[PDB]
Every structure is written in C-alpha cells, then in structure tokens.
C-alpha cells in the first residue's frame, strides 16, 4: 500500500471525502473495487455527490458497463474527471457521469474507438455506441463514423463533441 498510516491508503483518505480513483486498465478486479466504493458512498449519503477520477486505456466491456450501470443506479450523482487519458471503456464510463458534472484536464486526451462470437461483439459495440450518443447528444451514425477512426481528441474537441461539460483551469496563470 502507498502513503500509509495505521493499511490506511492515500486513496482511502480521498474516499472519506467521497472521491474514487479509477486507474489502469478496466478489468473485473479494479471494477468491483470501484463498484464497492460506489455502493458504500451511496449508502452513507445518497444526496452528496461522488467524484470519480478516471485515467484508463480501457479494457473489459462487461466490467466497464458494470461500473456504468452501478453509476446510473445509485441516486447520488457521480461527477467524473478525466485526467491523462480515457480510451475504449474509459470514455463510456467518464461520459456516463452526471450531465453537467463531467470534467477533463487540459492536456488529457480522449478516444471513443471501441476495439473488441462476432455477431455478439458487433451488438455490444452498438450498445456501446448507442451509449456514447445518449451521453453526447450526438447522432448514433456520427458516433459510429467517428469511432472507427483511431484518432485522439483534445479536451477542446471532447468539449465541442459533448462528452464533457468543462475543462479544468490552469490556476497557475
């Protein structure tokens, strides 16, 4: 464990203040840690916001969509904050945050391409694209068309597209 007082992580201090770090590739283990943290924070107080910092290259669709259904299901609004990068399921997750409370760091980048029986994979990619469309107010056909490209979007581009609501300040100037 890293910065440790006594087992008591730096991350566990941030959790007292309702913050959750989503970090590294999304696979079942970290997803269930994030999910447990959400059900816990909801149960403590379903009326205070939760702040879900996201920095992931992506990964498992099943685990990522489980975090997402968990997010939607808990009454508490889950703000999301992209830092460094969100790709693959990282964009599905981050964009599914509460409309008006989705943020992003200025130098971070965003990537909505979803790399994946094949009949089923195609269905899943459609559900995933459907969701990015609902999250951005954009048309499904636009998202499908934009996603098949392997282009990274700036925070400015991600804002104009609708996946987020404000880019974080450079409070040093």
Give the nearest distance from C-beta 95 to Ca ion in angstroms: 10
- 100 touching its own copies, by CB under 8 A: no
d(CA 26, CA 22) in angstroms, rounded, equals 8
Q: Are 5 and 23 in contact (CB under 8 A)?
A: no
Rule CB under 8 A: say whether 71 interacts with its own copies. Answer: yes
Catalytic site residue from 12, 33, 60, 113: 113
- Per DSSP, 96 falls in state T
| Residue 113 falls in the annotated catalytic set | yes
3-state secondary structure of 104: strand
Please report whether residue 65 would count as binding its own copies according to CB under 8 A.
Answer: yes
Q: Indicate whether 158 belongs to the interface with its own copies (CB under 8 A).
A: no
Shortest CA distance to 158 belongs to which of 130, 135, 139? 135
Reference 135, options 168, 169, 86, 170; nearest CA is 86
Interface with its own copies, residue 145, by CB under 8 A? no
* Cβ nearer to its own copies, comparing 12 with 138: 12
Binding residue for its own copies (CB under 8 A) from 59, 70, 102, 158?
Answer: 70
Contact residues for Ca ion, defined by CB under 5 A: 74, 77-78, 134, 172
């Amino acid at each position: 464990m890293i910065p440790v007082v006594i087992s008591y992580d730096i991350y566990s201090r941030l959790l007292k203040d309702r913050i959750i770090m989503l970090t590294g590739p999304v696979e079942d283990n970290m997803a269930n840690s994030v999910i447990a943290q959400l059900l816990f924070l909801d149960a403590q107080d379903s009326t205070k916001d939760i702040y879900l910092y996201v920095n992931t290259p992506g990964g498992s669709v099943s685990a990522g969509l489980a975090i997402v259904d968990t997010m939607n299901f808990i009454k508490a609004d889950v703000q999301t904050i992209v830092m460094g990068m969100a790709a693959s399921m990282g964009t599905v997750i981050a964009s599914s945050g509460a409309k008006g409370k989705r943020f992003m760091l200025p130098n971070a980048e965003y990537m909505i391409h979803q790399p994946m029986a094949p009949e089923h994979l195609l269905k899943t990619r459609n559900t995933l694209e459907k969701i990015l469309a609902e999250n951005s107010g954009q048309s499904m056909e636009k998202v499908h068309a934009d996603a098949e490209r392997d282009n990274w979007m700036s925070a400015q581009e991600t804002l104009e597209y609708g996946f987020i609501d404000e880019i974080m300040a450079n409070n040093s100037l």
